[PDB]
Symmetry: C2
């Protein structure tokens, strides 16, 4: 029923409930952001709200306030009619949290009050509730739909006539009646998903045709119940509750699929547990389908050679978008002879399928021990991969494929622009893709375009003079293997990550979304279990909002007032349980006295391998000591044990031993105990937690729960209803009475084993896991935690089939591992502070291995929870990350420059030197000349510089022509090459009367600012010194009436510049320094004929004689010499110009 | 009973998945050896596996299964391709005309415009390897390459297709042809086909669309027949290099991969059982509907400015299928009270 918005006409939008400190902390940063960045800018606001502080209530209150503001604007915009409705999203990874949040939002709408009276009337409430829609998965969406609604929609759209659809509908309808059974339930879920998919497909087909049904009244209501997204499409709702996977995938409406990522302009996005979404977004990114690069490029090269778009206004300027791609495809096909299929040669290539990994910038690894080449056998008409480079071919093919996808996105945008003027981006996007693919006959790429469009359509580039980062470029993984069913053809199955979760988040912020990430550990200093916030700060800058110290202090005060442990006498006890061999040995001997050999036979009963006996003994001793200390407690009743392993039936022997020890201590202490083994997400979600709550509420005694750090993060809240008759006064309330509407309590004792399994993994596919591991390695390298050497070794091991144990072993060496461990510990204890009821004493049992990790915590504790503060303070009583991180980034920046510069020079020496490459080269040289150092690392030239420990200069040691991984910097090289203003002799260079005016006019830096960021060794040597020499030579010579012209592309970068002089007609070429040389002379002359060459050193000693050299670089008479060598154009001692050198040079040309 | 219907849907999908993985494992270098209990269990799951290993020669199955073929541990076995010397006992033979016709009418429709454009694009350039495996195969496709180039030049296949007439937009254009002398079109007016080099579009407005569609169908069927002949030649070559069904899977995949025509894989597999079973459509041959069949083309929009030609073919009648089975060497015993109605 259309509850009119008019019911808010008299509603007082100025009247608001009292804002709690959290509400102010949310609103003030948003207020300032609007001032600084304006209305249309996005923002990311990580909110570290501790557990139990009211984070969910604050987020939902903010959402309701935004909804009311939208209602106000709607009431004001009715006169204008421009209804710019803004979408609000509440996103999280767990469906349970989504449903709970939506229910709580509705409850808040119903029960919220202002000054003791209901805030909204019944009609206002009914209107607001209609604005909120939940978007579950397709199977559950169908199952929740009633039979009447489904029959109504089928009749309305006439689908009941089709036999198959009715058969499937009936086959689902009856299964509903037996849904109680588990296997029947899973089968019904599968069938419901399939049927919903097909039904929505048919409905969209029906609506797209000329027979578009008219939705209204009962049919409209039924459709909106079947397709909740329809309510959003028709503007009956802006608020959407859904999961991160659903948010990324999008949801269907009556007409087409809607992808929120493509319509984030002006959206508000509340992400609960934001840090956890890095793993979820990564998991979605790793499920992308692999592509056969050979097939893709051959299809693209063939269909683009001839097929054309039509010349209607719908394709204004679209044909030009593909012109570069057509030329590149033709060139690539000619170079690599794509008229031939591909095949491998040699026994080793046949024995193992090849694998190539590339981060697309400077990290390249291949499973082949030898360098695999690629030749075209025109006799056999095959392209043979035998031991050009296969790596180069694959890289170029990937570049062309990604270029095609990006050009398709650009063409869709242009098509939408054109259609708008012909007289709704998502609707046009479906129309634009189909038309473009059909015109080019590329319908095979429809799936590839759709999947990539939303993820990477948010869209700086993989170039120097751009903000280079792994989070834009991602990574590529290619498998070269025989085509199934053939033994002579081969396919290049490539799997891509085109961006990291941090890149996705940054693109969402840049698209205009305002993101509120509420999470106790939103800013954990890790890049594997959290977004790379250094990268986010660089890309966003001001848009990455943060709480001022005053706001953090207000949050701390609110937390303490809401959880006043000190006033109410709640005490925290921390016990660092070490390993005790005698204790475990005695327990085992009591467990089975029959075993004469206490160690070996008993450990064999437990099934422990001889090698694992020590580790198993240690961790079991710690666990049993914790359990004993817990049971010895008089009042503590609920113990939660977090282990690195789950105690399922595979560990039944250790389970029985633990149960025996628990029973022994219960009988000794005469306290009933209940143990729960194998508490995984599924078990507690299904049955376990209900029985746990029953035991806690109805029976007196202690409870011990065994779970895992992973399982506990996807379970119910570890809280239970308090029975006052049973608990008595043992429970202390830490909050005000007005808040405790219901009496509940949570864990009072906890055991924390050291986390070790802290690397992400994707069980969806073998390729997905490979992509996940490579992403983690590259994220660590990008952050600076791993040196390029270590990162490359780890990547190579990953390609070869690294074991998870070895992967973890290499992860543990990074401080990122310690940060992740601290984050996981903080999340573990944080579940203790959920409820306002606490025992007088809280038992914190933690493995001794966490002492050093927790002892090194240094963050501001103003946002820590009480349990975490207790742990940290206890650890610190017993009595780096930014320096080694600085050394690593120096190597990475240098390595990236070395490989990028080498690649760029290689391209410039490809005879048709591209305009873009030449422009990039000149841009790099100009940047280095103008800004040899910079105060803050630049956004667009970040890889030209490294952050030196000493301002204005640094020391290094490495071979600029050798391995980039062998470089060393700063203190590790006390005696080594110095990168400083003095080494380049810039100070002496500028003293020349001509160089100084030239530099000042050009804006080049005549001196080095003593800044922290300095150019990397590769730049300083190869680029900066050469640029200085060229500029000085041009300045001095130009003073003597010399004129300079850009060298033609065909021979670009092989000579400095072309110089014309009065009275000389033959070409003159200049080469500036600050057998191979003979081959260059031949190359230039054979094409441009005879010419006079100048080889001049900008700085040096003028006393050295002028040498006239022939084409072969042997001294000869000036008339016979084709090359004139000037030992030093400017004096190196007094900066005076070598006038005599100029006079002799001028005479040299006039001899012709 | 309702649980059985859902269970059968799940069981069929899973059976296809399990056998597909089982065949992939056998195809791979790490083939799974089956003996004793494992061979007996695999034979129980696949009745076809017993026929493949020669454990059993007699097969009881339905006409639909016989035409479709049955899986073994290694691949799909199509009895129509191995009828040499094979006796048959067709109960109620006269009724099988309807069943074979029903199977023949289920073939997937093909977009002639897309098919011909893809064929032209991929045949203008790509070439087979000169190894003994393709000795004399490249010559089979030479006429087809020339015909594709000529067809593309004549009909300007560089441009997509669209309809200019309002009548064409209002009513979908259906074309029917028996391929010999019976031609009918739903369009009241004769539909022409012009290339607008200014608009870079091929426009169907009220050359002939009928001529274009007929030639496209001829070229497509020619491609499928040449693929069948190339598979036969590949099998012949492989024998000398030092059985037909296994090599047929190997020959089709290699030929399509070399030409970059993997998108036609599905079309080829359907074509051999129905038309590889076997005169031509020439006055100097044995003309008959029963081995020329019929074609039904449906011209409609894909987009509102691009058009596709969804063609559905009957390449032979049930009588043609039966005659080809007899000619292949099968001895057929059709027992039926009205066998000669």
């Amino acid at each position: 029923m259309n509850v009119s918005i008019e019911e808010f006409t008299h509603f007082d939008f100025q009247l608001v409930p009292e804002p709690s400190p959290l509400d102010l902390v949310i609103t003030e940063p948003l207020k300032n952001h609007i001032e600084v960045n304006g209305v249309k800018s996005g923002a990311l606001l990580p909110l570290p709200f501790q557990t139990g502080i009211g984070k969910t209530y604050t987020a939902l209150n903010f959402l309701l306030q935004q909804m009311l503001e939208q209602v106000r604007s709607e009431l004001k915009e009715e006169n204008t009619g421009k209804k710019s409705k803004r979408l609000l999203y509440y996103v999280t990874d767990s469906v349970d949290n989504v449903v709970s949040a939506k229910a709580d939002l509705l409850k808040l709408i119903e029960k919220q009050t202002v000054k003791g009276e209901p805030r909204f009337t019944l009609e206002q409430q009914e209107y607001l509730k209609a604005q909120i829609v939940h978007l579950p998965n397709q199977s559950e969406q169908l199952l929740q739909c009633s039979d009447a609604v489904l029959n109504d929609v089928l009749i309305g759209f006439n689908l009941n006539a089709e036999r198959d659809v009715q058969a499937e509908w009936s086959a689902i309808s009856g299964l509903r009646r037996h849904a109680s059974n588990p296997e029947v339930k899973i089968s019904l879920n599968r069938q419901a998903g399939y049927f919903y998919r097909n039904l929505i497909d048919r409905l969209q087909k029906k609506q797209k045709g000329a027979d578009r049904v008219l939705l209204s009244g009962s049919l409209l209501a039924s459709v909106e119940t079947l397709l909740p997204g329809e309510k959003i499409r028709n503007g009956s709702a802006h608020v959407a509750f859904l999961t991160t996977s659903k948010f990324l995938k999008g949801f269907h409406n009556t007409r087409s699929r809607y992808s929120p990522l493509r319509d984030l302009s002006g959206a508000v996005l509340i992400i609960d547990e934001i840090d956890k979404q890095n793993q979820v977004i990564l998991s979605e990114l790793c499920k992308q389908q692999a592509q056969d690069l050979i097939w893709a490029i051959r299809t693209l090269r063939a269909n683009f050679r001839d097929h054309q778009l039509e010349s209607s206004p719908r394709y204004d300027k679209i044909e030009d978008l593909f012109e570069p791609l057509r030329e590149r495809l033709e060139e690539f096909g000619t170079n690599w002879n794509l008229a031939f299929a591909f095949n491998t040669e040699g026994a080793n290539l046949n024995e193992r399928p090849v694998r190539l990994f590339s981060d697309r910038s400077f990290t390249h690894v291949s499973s082949a021990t030898h360098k695999l080449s690629l030749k075209s056998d025109f006799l056999r008409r095959k392209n043979l991969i035998f031991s050009g480079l296969l790596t180069r071919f694959v890289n170029e093919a990937d570049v062309i494929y990604q270029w095609f996808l990006g050009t398709m996105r650009k063409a869709v945008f242009q098509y939408w622009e054109n259609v708008r003027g012909l007289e709704s981006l998502e609707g046009t996007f479906q129309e634009a893709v189909q038309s473009l693919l059909t015109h080019f006959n590329l319908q095979e790429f429809e799936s590839a375009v759709y999947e990539s469009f939303d993820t990477r359509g948010l869209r700086k580039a993989n170039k120097l003079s751009s903000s280079k980062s792994y989070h834009h470029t991602g990574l590529k993984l290619v498998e070269v293997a025989h085509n199934q069913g053939t033994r002579d053809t081969v396919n290049c199955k490539a799997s891509f990550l085109n961006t990291s979760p941090s890149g996705v988040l940054a693109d969402m912020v840049d698209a205009g979304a305002v993101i509120l990430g509420i999470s106790a550990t939103a800013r954990a200093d890790t890049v594997i279990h959290n977004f790379d916030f250094k990268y986010l700060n660089e890309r966003l800058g001001n848009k990455l909002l943060s709480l001022s110290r005053e706001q953090k202090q207000r949050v701390n005060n609110y937390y303490h007032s809401r959880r006043n442990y000190k006033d109410n006498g709640v005490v925290l006890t921390v016990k660092y349980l070490n390993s005790r061999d005698a204790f475990l040995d005695a327990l085992l001997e009591e467990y089975k006295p029959e075993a004469r050999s206490s160690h070996f036979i008993l450990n064999h009963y437990l099934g422990i391998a001889e090698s694992e006996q020590a580790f198993v003994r240690s961790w079991l001793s710690k666990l049993l000591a914790s359990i004993k200390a817990f049971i010895s407690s008089p009042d503590n009743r609920y113990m939660l044990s977090l282990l690195n392993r789950t105690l399922d039936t595979t560990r039944q022997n250790i389970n029985d031993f633990i149960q025996f020890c628990c029973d022994k201590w219960a009988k000794e202490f005469n306290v009933k105990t209940k143990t729960f083994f194998g508490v995984n997400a599924d078990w507690m979600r299904l049955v376990g937690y209900d029985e746990i709550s029953k035991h806690l509420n109805t029976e007196l005694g202690k409870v011990v729960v065994f779970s895992t750090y992973a399982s506990m993060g996807a379970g119910k809240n570890p809280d239970y209803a308090v029975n006052l008759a049973l608990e008595g006064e043992s429970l202390i309330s830490v909050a005000d009475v007005t808040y405790s509407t219901q009496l509940r309590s949570d864990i009072d004792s906890i055991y924390l084993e050291k986390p070790t399994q802290l690397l992400l993994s994707d069980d969806y596919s073998h390729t997905a896991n490979q992509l996940c591991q490579f992403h983690q390695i590259l994220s660590l390298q990008e952050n600076g935690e791993l040196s390029p050497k270590s990162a490359e070794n780890w990547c190579r091991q990953q390609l070869m089939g690294m074991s998870r144990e070895r992967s973890l072993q290499q992860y543990h060496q990074t401080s990122d591992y310690q940060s992740a461990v601290r984050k996981y510990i903080e999340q573990a204890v944080g579940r203790a502070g959920r409820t306002s009821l606490k025992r007088k004493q809280i038992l914190l049992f933690v493995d001794s291995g966490l002492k050093e990790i927790l002892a090194e915590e240094s963050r501001d504790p103003s946002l820590f929870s009480h349990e975490y503060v207790a742990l940290v303070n206890k650890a610190k009583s017993a009595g780096d990350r930014a320096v080694r991180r600085l050394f690593n980034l120096a190597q990475r920046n240098n390595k990236d420059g070395m490989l990028s510069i080498k690649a760029l020079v290689h391209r410039l020496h490809n005879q048709p030197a591209s305009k873009s490459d030449i422009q990039e080269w000149q841009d790099i040289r100009t940047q280095l000349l103008r800004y040899p150092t910079v105060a803050f690392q630049p956004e667009r030239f970040n890889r030209l510089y490294l952050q030196s420990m000493t301002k204005g200069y640094y020391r290094y040691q490495g071979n600029l022509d050798g391995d980039p991984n062998s470089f060393e910097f700063f203190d590790r090289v006390p005696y080594g090459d110095m990168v400083s203003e003095e080494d380049c002799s810039l100070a002496t260079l500028v003293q020349n009367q001509y160089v100084r005016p030239w530099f000042e006019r050009k804006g080049f830096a005549c001196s080095w600012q003593k800044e922290a960021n300095v150019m990397t060794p590769i730049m300083f040597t190869n680029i900066y010194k050469g640029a200085l020499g060229e500029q000085a030579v041009e300045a001095v010579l130009t003073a003597f009436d010399f004129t300079f012209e850009e060298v033609p592309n065909s021979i670009y970068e092989r000579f400095d510049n072309r110089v014309i002089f009065a009275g000389i007609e033959q070409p003159i070429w200049l080469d500036s320094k600050y057998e191979g040389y003979s081959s260059k002379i031949a190359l230039v002359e054979e094409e441009f004929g005879p010419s006079k060459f100048i080889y001049v050193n900008a700085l040096g000693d003028t006393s050295k004689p002028i040498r006239y050299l022939n084409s072969c670089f042997v001294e000869t008479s000036p008339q016979l010499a084709k090359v004139i060598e000037i030992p030093a154009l400017i004096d190196d001692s007094n900066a005076d110009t070598n006038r005599t050198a100029v006079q002799e040079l001028i005479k040299w040309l006039h001899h012709s």
